[PDB]
């Protein structure tokens, strides 16, 4: 008949977070499952109307329909300030190719409305490429684009256990590309990997290897919009670093240019981690299903492939991917009666100027 879901959390990257939704499995004798979901945190307020048939065809191919609104405040995400009020629709066909893999192709539309953009080099460079000529001295700028996209997704998940795996792998690869007629013209791809290799019969000692990769760029003069950039740093990418701090920093124009510590992301990104999961001290091995200890080496880099270091010779070369950030630490996780609790302590041993260290990082509930 339906379902109401409510979730709450606190994280050092996104502050307090809410998750709420309601669904009807056969809304007014239509056969499709209509739903409404929301999300709020320090920097984003999302909402959407969904309508999904779980068995569109007998083969198992589904047809999902989405209608959304989204508000994003960049300074509340540790980035150079901007505001993106976006809204749109997405249609997606889901193909369960087998019990471990699933694919998904879809079409989309997104209206993006930028505002409150302090004049900075990487952001203005993109605005110039789009035909805008904003003032290099006025804090009050706006920009609107209407894009159409083809979206692709692949999810592989051959893990033994959903929460606290000891063996197997998970891969997620998403892609998207603008369709002609769109204001922007770019592609964007992301790759996420997780591999658990147990080093003992009882699976109490497990080596976990993770990677995250991102690459996006323009097609025909236009650059990828800065609102679609990649980021690294935070408890979910490179522990020990403040959320999104890694990579290029805003070079502001005078209100000669100011170099800064405010992160701006980039169109390229790479993150690798090696984690050794162990039995928890002072706790029994019967609780490894709900408590987990681990030691890790995290590292990542984010770069701007269009940063022209020839004309910005004094400032750092942000098109250089060789500035590999690194950290080492210990993590503790507990599936508590309040949901998943994760506490980590990492000391960044290799950091570039601008990078902000956040040694203690903690997450409880949904994030």
């Amino acid at each position: 008949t339906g379902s109401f879901n409510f979730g709450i959390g606190y994280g050092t990257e996104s502050g307090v977070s809410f998750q709420a939704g309601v669904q009807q499995d056969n809304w007014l004798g239509t056969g499709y499952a209509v739903g409404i979901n929301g999300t709020k945190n320090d920097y984003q307020t999302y909402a959407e109307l969904s309508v999904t048939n779980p068995y569109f065809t007998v083969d198992g191919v589904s047809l999902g329909g989405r209608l959304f609104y989204n508000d994003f405040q960049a300074d509340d995400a540790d980035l150079s300030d901007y505001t993106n009020k976006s809204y749109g629709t997405d249609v997606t066909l889901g193909f369960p190719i087998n019990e471990y893999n699933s694919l998904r192709a879809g079409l989309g539309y997104v209206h993006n409305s930028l505002s409150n953009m302090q004049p900075q080099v990487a952001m203005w460079r993109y605005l110039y490429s789009m035909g805008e000529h904003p003032s290099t001295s006025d804090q009050d700028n706006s920009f609107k684009t209407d894009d159409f996209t083809f979206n692709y997704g692949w999810t592989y998940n051959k893990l033994d256990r959903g929460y606290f795996p000891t063996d197997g792998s998970r891969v997620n690869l998403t892609g998207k590309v603008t369709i002609p007629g769109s204001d922007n013209e770019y592609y964007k791809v992301t790759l996420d990997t997780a591999t658990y290799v147990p080093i003992d019969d009882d699976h109490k000692w497990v080596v976990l290897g993770r990677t995250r990769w991102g690459y996006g760029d323009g097609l025909g003069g236009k650059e990828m919009p800065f609102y679609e950039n990649f980021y690294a740093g935070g408890s979910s990418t490179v522990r020990g670093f403040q959320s999104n701090t890694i990579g290029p920093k805003a070079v502001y124009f005078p209100h000669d240019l100011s170099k800064s510590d405010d992160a701006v992301g980039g169109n390229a990104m790479a993150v690798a981690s090696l984690e050794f999961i162990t039995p928890t001290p002072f706790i029994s091995d019967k609780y490894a299903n709900s408590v987990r200890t681990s030691f890790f080496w995290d590292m990542g880099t984010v770069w701007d492939t269009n940063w022209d270091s020839s004309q910005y010779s004094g400032y750092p070369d942000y098109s250089d991917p060789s500035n590999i950030r690194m950290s080492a630490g210990i993590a503790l996780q507990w599936m508590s009666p309040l949901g998943p609790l994760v506490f980590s302590y990492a000391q960044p041993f290799k950091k570039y100027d601008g990078d902000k260290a956040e040694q203690f990082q903690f997450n409880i509930g949904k994030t």
């Binding site: 008949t1 339906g2 379902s3 109401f4 879901n5 409510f6 979730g7 709450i8 959390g9 998750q19 929460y163 309040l338 949901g339 998943p340 509930g365 949904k366």
Partner: peptide, 10 residues
Amino acid sequence: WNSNVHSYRF
């Protein structure tokens, strides 16, 4: 992970 306060189906 999701709906840690209430995952209610009816």
